[PDB]
Amino acid sequence: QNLKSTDRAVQQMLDKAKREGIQTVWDRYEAMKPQCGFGETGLCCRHCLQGPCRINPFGDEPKVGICGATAEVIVARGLDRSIAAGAAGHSGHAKHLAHTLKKAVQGKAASYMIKDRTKLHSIAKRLGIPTEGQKDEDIALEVAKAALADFHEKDTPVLWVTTVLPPSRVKVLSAHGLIPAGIDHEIAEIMHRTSMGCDADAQNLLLGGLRCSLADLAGCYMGTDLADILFGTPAPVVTESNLGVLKADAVNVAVHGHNPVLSDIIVSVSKEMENEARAAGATGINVVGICCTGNEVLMRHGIPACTHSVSQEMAMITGALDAMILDYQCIQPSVATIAECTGTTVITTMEMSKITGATHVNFAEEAAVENAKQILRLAIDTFKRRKGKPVEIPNIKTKVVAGFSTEAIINALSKLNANDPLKPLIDNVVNGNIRGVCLFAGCNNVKVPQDQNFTTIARKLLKQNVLVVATGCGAGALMRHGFMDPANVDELCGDGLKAVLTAIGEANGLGGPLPPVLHMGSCVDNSRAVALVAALANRLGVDLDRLPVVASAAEAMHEKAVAIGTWAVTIGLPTHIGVLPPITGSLPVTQILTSSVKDITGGYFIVELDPETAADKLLAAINERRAGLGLPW
Amino acid sequence: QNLKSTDRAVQQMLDKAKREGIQTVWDRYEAMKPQCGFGETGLCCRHCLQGPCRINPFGDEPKVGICGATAEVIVARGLDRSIAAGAAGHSGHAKHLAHTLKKAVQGKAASYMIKDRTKLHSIAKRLGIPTEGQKDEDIALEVAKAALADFHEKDTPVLWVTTVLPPSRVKVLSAHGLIPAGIDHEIAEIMHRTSMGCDADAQNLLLGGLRCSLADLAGCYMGTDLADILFGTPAPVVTESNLGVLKADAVNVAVHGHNPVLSDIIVSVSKEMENEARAAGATGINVVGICCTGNEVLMRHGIPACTHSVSQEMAMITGALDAMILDYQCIQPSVATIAECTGTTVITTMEMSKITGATHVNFAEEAAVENAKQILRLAIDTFKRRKGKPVEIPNIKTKVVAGFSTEAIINALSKLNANDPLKPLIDNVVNGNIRGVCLFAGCNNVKVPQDQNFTTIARKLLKQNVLVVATGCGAGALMRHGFMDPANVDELCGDGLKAVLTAIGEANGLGGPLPPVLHMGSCVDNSRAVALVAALANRLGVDLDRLPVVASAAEAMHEKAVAIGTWAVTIGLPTHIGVLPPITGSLPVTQILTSSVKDITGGYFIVELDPETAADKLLAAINERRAGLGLPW
Ligand code: SF4
Ligand code: SF4
Ligand code: FES
Ligand code: FES
Ligand SMILES: [Fe+2]
Ligand SMILES: [Fe+2]
């Protein structure tokens, strides 16, 4: 089982699934091999009913699509549609939150409110919305209206791009025509230009993809902004992760998917329903997280993380998961079938994301507490049905310190320099105690032994004094392997990095260091890393493409991860991807994405499937940036 | 060559291409065989980087996608993305025209103007925009703003759906949640819900597809509306079609793609440049049409149609095509390479639709006449370069009567009944002189011998007294085979239909009948057929799903044709498709689309590749509708 996952809790549940005859994602992958080499390389097109078309990577015919589309075109069009799809998921998430904020301050959804007034005012200021002498509700209405307005063309470009990046970066992007006009506008334009008989120039197509990736960034940033207003900006919190956070004697409820509009209310209502749970013979309701919505409630409330991404089915295999409450994205639809075996009640809540065989309980923000209680009573009933059945919860968990929003990192740093909080971090980049910064992002992928790339690359970077931050299921991987426990600083960190983490933590009264890796939140909260990096660029008076900052989507899966990787490149970062995206069938497209885009945005992809080699390449990219700043390395 | 195309002009050029060693679309198709059976059946997914996934239609593993996606889900998701792509092309086209109208009436694009004031006022009235005591420019600004507003969520649904269908049809759709909230909103929601780990219920997915298809209808209707305001509503016109419309002694310029914003100006400027052409030794500039933009200028100005769809490369093979002026959609990118052999100057004009190797001359509506002159001087220069080279223009053309907008059909009918113009048509449906109405729509497809399905089905329906209307390259197929020449009424039409066409034509002073098939315009002008059918429904006091009206996408290719077929079903029509869409890998999805959708919208797909059998099935669908109205059949 170590060939499937490096997580021992997952390994134990894989053994249970095997002896019970429950098919898993790894089993479905084995049954798919060998995968199609046309799809793997990107040399397949189904954009019209003359298809399917393919192109042999090498050899004889077919060499070109039926309409004349070259390998360059076909590869670029497929990639662009993946970017648009990722941007779309983020569009739905951010729009969901904008409409919730609007309903809240209009009196239409009393379960929701302005929780972070300071965040609201700062966002208003950044956007140019007046606040002096205005009521909070009015300010919030204006911020929500501005959010919705960024989805379509208007007299300004997308403000959740142009107001979040330094002017010099906006200028570089503008000169290449890359600033998005509207989020859903760009998505639609990608779908148009990639349809048959439209754009058929690889460079042109890929420039369109870069612009659409900035529409994805806007959606991520908007999502973080609005979720902080509604639910609170994260601050440092302590919790636990891995399957051992499940409790046989409690009603175990996983929140899975993405939007805190749902999960945040599940958490608060679960506490209100403690005595009912107890009446049912449980100790209470134990809410646990899976995937990004789990990260959201981990970051804000310390809700323990059960599992992530590829291993999500394993929570069910314990026999103790009473309910799995879903909104959208990254949910293996297998969960609905596995539930029939395990007893778990799988509940969908959003009209556009249903799964055949799952119970659907519409969740309306207008009725959020009522709808949550209906959902949680299904969970309590399920708990009662497993009275006396043995369960197998691996007794495996890690300690996790998390909650490192950008505000929280700045506050922590301010204990070393009150009126110039970024300066202690920069001082230590300059003196070499901090070599650079690496953001780990994105998914696990069944092709890669689960977490192996994240932990292999992170260990090499930490020993080389890189400040490592993480989001999404990258953060999930690292937390499940102890990278968020300050007790592991001595083992994992280089001496320079250890000194910095210790100095910050001691200044924050911890008696101890910050954790080895800073958890910056969900996948939309990759936008928090952008805020931190943009703040550093502005403090230094340089653009992002001069900073010793890199990203790694070390085990990427979703279209959303493709979009995030692409905007990381577009804003100026060297960006590793540890799985093959479907580009290798076109050398000209690969050369664009890994080399000549440097001349456009300063960023570039690093495609490298071997994690030791990836770590070396990421260090070389950091050190090249250090040399460009005149720094030792 | 008759196995490739049933068009003798195309056959002649296929012989020329063969002896000159010029690869064609048919050659590229042969080189693609056998095509992938996973793609053909829809049983392939590339929606994440764990893919590509496939499912064996029959036999053993693989049976399910890696994430657990079933065949039902995979097929429905792929279909939905094709619908969204089609809607996107129509979004770009309609938005292009809305922005042009806005610029025109703001003084920013003087080459454009309100040409159809009556159309402007009628659209304003339909939308609920006041006109009394307003200036035209102000009314037009409001119509343009309303058009743009339909792309995003607002306080009303998409008005280019809800104001163009009868209230009872809107009510049926509303009850199923199918009215679109915004055009680009729906496109993005499709891309989201079809991304990994989101919607995974076939019925739910397909309902989303029906709603997105209505966003495509809205874009089509908006495109027709705005193009009529700007360029004039079509009225009956006489012209010619097929390759023989090219003239060796003229500068031959094809307009190809879709938007009349470009082609309409090319036509007017070409006339202004006649003496320059002559100075260059040509007789003048001979503008000819390809694909929908050709249909646009055919319908409004009588510009002759050179060719359509799959045979577009053959215009170049004559050696006489001096320029091919492109905007977007349905342009085989092979044209850029073939031009190197033939001498033709291929010119792109839109930032989102470039072709490697083609000359790009940006076209700005603000500078339309200047930009058109630059384009046309490239064409004149090309003419001069072929002085003394032999050309091979097949001396093959047909007469075409066209220009049958809905307004034009109503006006023609009003000569028989001035104050109840639809009544003569209904009278003849009732007495059986008109059995029903069939709309032919959509593309040619290289899999089908070009035009064979359109002409085979049309001949059977016309002998059975069906009133046949056509758009796009369906209209193209029929016009190239003589179905738009009134001289062929005796041969083609049943006696009842002949009597009706004769009576209308004689009442309109023609001395002769209307043509066998009524050309209702470009593919967006499928919306004109909707206007006619909705007007008939309202006059009769019934919904569209009770009328003896059908549609046939007899040789469909583009994603746009998939979208149009799907909204034809959604508004209540039996809708034939004569090529296999990638659905056969899921029986449950096929059963939805061909049978149980009848219980939702009253419409349904008829998938039938044999055209004689298709004609029988279309007649049975018409006759079932007649029986439901209590009529003989
Ligand atoms: S768009 Fe071109 S390459 Fe793609 S399926 Fe259609 S003919 Fe083939
Ligand atoms: S979304 Fe599911 S079926 Fe599609 S490629 Fe990814 S794992 Fe395979
Ligand atoms: S030929 Fe396998 S992905 Fe299309
Ligand atoms: S396996 Fe051929 S279309 Fe994917
Ligand atoms: Fe996520
Ligand atoms: Fe068209």
XYZ file of N, CA and C in Angstrom, chain B residues 113-187:
225
model
N -24.505 52.930 -38.312
C -25.677 53.764 -38.093
C -26.908 52.903 -37.895
N -27.960 53.542 -37.442
C -29.265 52.907 -37.414
C -29.839 52.895 -38.824
N -29.826 51.741 -39.469
C -30.412 51.595 -40.806
C -31.880 51.174 -40.785
N -32.280 50.387 -39.783
C -33.681 49.962 -39.655
C -34.306 50.497 -38.390
N -34.853 51.698 -38.561
C -35.485 52.371 -37.472
C -36.709 51.657 -36.964
N -37.470 51.083 -37.896
C -38.663 50.335 -37.503
C -38.303 49.143 -36.651
N -37.258 48.410 -37.041
C -36.770 47.236 -36.253
C -36.326 47.741 -34.887
N -35.607 48.857 -34.861
C -35.167 49.359 -33.563
C -36.317 49.604 -32.619
N -37.365 50.264 -33.100
C -38.510 50.576 -32.267
C -39.278 49.315 -31.848
N -39.393 48.357 -32.750
C -40.105 47.143 -32.383
C -39.368 46.331 -31.333
N -38.050 46.259 -31.433
C -37.245 45.577 -30.418
C -37.356 46.281 -29.072
N -37.274 47.609 -29.095
C -37.425 48.410 -27.878
C -38.771 48.082 -27.227
N -39.839 48.116 -28.055
C -41.171 47.774 -27.511
C -41.226 46.376 -26.876
N -40.657 45.392 -27.549
C -40.675 44.037 -27.044
C -39.946 43.932 -25.723
N -38.916 44.746 -25.587
C -38.089 44.670 -24.383
C -38.660 45.507 -23.247
N -39.634 46.363 -23.543
C -40.234 47.228 -22.563
C -39.558 48.566 -22.378
N -38.693 48.923 -23.324
C -37.989 50.209 -23.372
C -38.872 51.273 -24.028
N -39.157 52.357 -23.313
C -39.981 53.419 -23.891
C -39.377 54.077 -25.127
N -40.281 54.435 -26.035
C -39.879 55.104 -27.232
C -40.521 56.450 -27.483
N -41.701 56.657 -26.993
C -42.478 57.858 -27.153
C -41.648 59.030 -26.651
N -41.469 60.046 -27.496
C -40.692 61.216 -27.125
C -39.209 61.018 -26.867
N -38.676 59.870 -27.299
C -37.252 59.658 -27.206
C -36.544 59.804 -28.538
N -35.283 60.202 -28.535
C -34.494 60.214 -29.743
C -34.088 58.787 -30.098
N -33.978 58.476 -31.393
C -33.545 57.172 -31.872
C -32.202 56.746 -31.249
N -31.310 57.713 -31.155
C -29.987 57.344 -30.656
C -30.113 56.898 -29.213
N -31.041 57.545 -28.504
C -31.214 57.186 -27.095
C -31.880 55.828 -26.945
N -32.851 55.569 -27.829
C -33.498 54.264 -27.801
C -32.489 53.174 -28.075
N -31.638 53.408 -29.097
C -30.642 52.452 -29.504
C -29.627 52.231 -28.396
N -29.254 53.282 -27.669
C -28.330 53.102 -26.567
C -28.937 52.202 -25.516
N -30.215 52.419 -25.269
C -30.885 51.561 -24.291
C -30.998 50.127 -24.746
N -31.272 49.877 -26.031
C -31.318 48.505 -26.538
C -29.937 47.860 -26.418
N -28.863 48.565 -26.737
C -27.496 48.032 -26.659
C -27.144 47.719 -25.204
N -27.534 48.595 -24.298
C -27.259 48.373 -22.881
C -28.033 47.151 -22.393
N -29.283 46.999 -22.823
C -30.057 45.817 -22.476
C -29.423 44.546 -23.021
N -28.911 44.584 -24.258
C -28.214 43.453 -24.816
C -27.032 43.037 -23.951
N -26.184 44.017 -23.622
C -25.019 43.712 -22.776
C -25.421 43.205 -21.419
N -26.535 43.699 -20.849
C -26.968 43.337 -19.516
C -27.404 41.867 -19.489
N -27.890 41.295 -20.570
C -28.318 39.912 -20.634
C -27.130 38.940 -20.532
N -25.903 39.430 -20.563
C -24.752 38.513 -20.433
C -24.485 38.138 -18.977
N -25.021 38.876 -18.007
C -24.743 38.663 -16.573
C -26.010 38.645 -15.755
N -25.895 38.132 -14.521
C -27.065 38.150 -13.622
C -27.513 39.593 -13.383
N -28.794 39.766 -13.167
C -29.408 41.050 -12.806
C -30.785 40.763 -12.258
N -31.652 41.763 -12.152
C -32.941 41.633 -11.505
C -33.948 40.947 -12.419
N -33.655 40.740 -13.671
C -34.503 40.045 -14.604
C -33.694 38.881 -15.212
N -34.358 37.864 -15.703
C -33.675 36.805 -16.450
C -33.274 37.358 -17.814
N -32.710 36.491 -18.634
C -32.306 36.861 -19.985
C -33.544 37.199 -20.822
N -33.672 38.484 -21.179
C -34.822 39.013 -21.866
C -34.853 38.530 -23.324
N -33.686 38.252 -23.901
C -33.655 37.676 -25.243
C -34.015 36.192 -25.230
N -34.467 35.642 -24.109
C -35.285 34.433 -24.035
C -36.751 34.741 -23.692
N -36.932 35.432 -22.554
C -38.282 35.549 -21.999
C -39.178 36.451 -22.806
N -38.657 37.348 -23.619
C -39.484 38.239 -24.407
C -39.671 37.764 -25.857
N -39.092 36.592 -26.205
C -39.170 36.120 -27.582
C -39.941 34.830 -27.711
N -40.305 34.191 -26.639
C -41.088 32.977 -26.613
C -42.449 33.289 -25.975
N -43.470 32.566 -26.338
C -44.810 32.817 -25.730
C -44.778 32.609 -24.227
N -45.583 33.368 -23.490
C -45.694 33.153 -22.051
C -45.894 31.708 -21.643
N -46.737 30.961 -22.362
C -46.924 29.585 -21.918
C -45.656 28.756 -22.050
N -44.823 28.974 -23.019
C -43.535 28.282 -23.177
C -42.596 28.757 -22.077
N -42.544 30.053 -21.794
C -41.692 30.545 -20.689
C -42.094 29.886 -19.391
N -43.405 29.718 -19.174
C -43.879 29.086 -17.942
C -43.432 27.655 -17.832
N -43.519 26.855 -18.888
C -43.068 25.470 -18.867
C -41.578 25.397 -18.536
N -40.795 26.272 -19.169
C -39.348 26.287 -18.970
C -39.002 26.719 -17.546
N -39.664 27.753 -17.072
C -39.451 28.265 -15.729
C -39.724 27.185 -14.692
N -40.757 26.397 -14.912
C -41.117 25.385 -13.932
C -40.064 24.320 -13.800
N -39.253 24.134 -14.841
C -38.148 23.198 -14.831
C -36.810 23.869 -14.511
N -36.846 25.155 -14.190
C -35.637 25.885 -13.861
C -34.735 26.157 -15.055
N -35.285 26.229 -16.267
C -34.469 26.276 -17.486
C -34.259 27.659 -18.040
N -34.869 28.698 -17.474
C -34.645 30.040 -18.033
C -33.261 30.534 -17.603
N -32.402 30.918 -18.554
C -31.056 31.401 -18.201
C -31.056 32.700 -17.419
N -30.121 32.789 -16.472
C -29.944 33.963 -15.654
C -29.096 35.040 -16.317
N -28.150 34.627 -17.165
C -27.293 35.512 -17.887
C -26.539 34.664 -18.899
N -26.189 35.156 -20.053
C -25.577 34.312 -21.060
C -24.221 33.798 -20.634
N -23.306 34.697 -20.282
C -21.974 34.244 -19.889
C -22.005 33.587 -18.506
N -22.979 33.955 -17.679
C -23.182 33.276 -16.412
C -23.414 31.792 -16.623
N -24.327 31.449 -17.575
C -24.642 30.037 -17.833
C -23.440 29.311 -18.402
N -22.709 29.948 -19.319
C -21.521 29.312 -19.895
C -20.574 28.942 -18.777
